[PDB]
C-alpha cells in the first residue's frame, strides 16, 4: 500500500516521490548539523579565551 | 649614640637627618602599596572576564 501523503502517485513517480523525500530530509538534517557544528565552534572559543 | 650614615650630625640636624629618613622610606612604602594595588586591579579583570 502506497504510505505518504500525495497517495495518488503510482508507477515511476512513486518511487520520484521517494527520492525527494530522501533527499530533503537528508538536507535537514545537514542542516540541522550545521547548526551542532557553529555552537561547537562557539564554545571552543569561549572555553580557549578563559585558558588565556 | 648617633646611628646610621652622616653620624657628624648633632643638635637639631640630627632631628632633620630623622624625619627626612621617616619621609622617604613612607613614601618608599606607598610605592610597593601602589604596585600591590595595581597588581590587584588586573587580576579583577582577568577573572570577572573569566565569569563572563
Known amino acids: 500500500p502506497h504510505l505518504g501523503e500525495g497517495g495518488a502517485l503510482t508507477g ?24 551542532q557544528q557553529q555552537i561547537e565552534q562557539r564554545r571552543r572559543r569561549a572555553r580557549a579565551q578563559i585558558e588565556a
Open 12 to 35: 515511476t513517480a512513486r518511487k520520484a516521490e521517494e527520492a525527494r523525500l530522501r533527499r530533503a530530509e537528508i538536507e535537514r538534517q545537514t542542516e540541522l548539523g550545521r547548526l
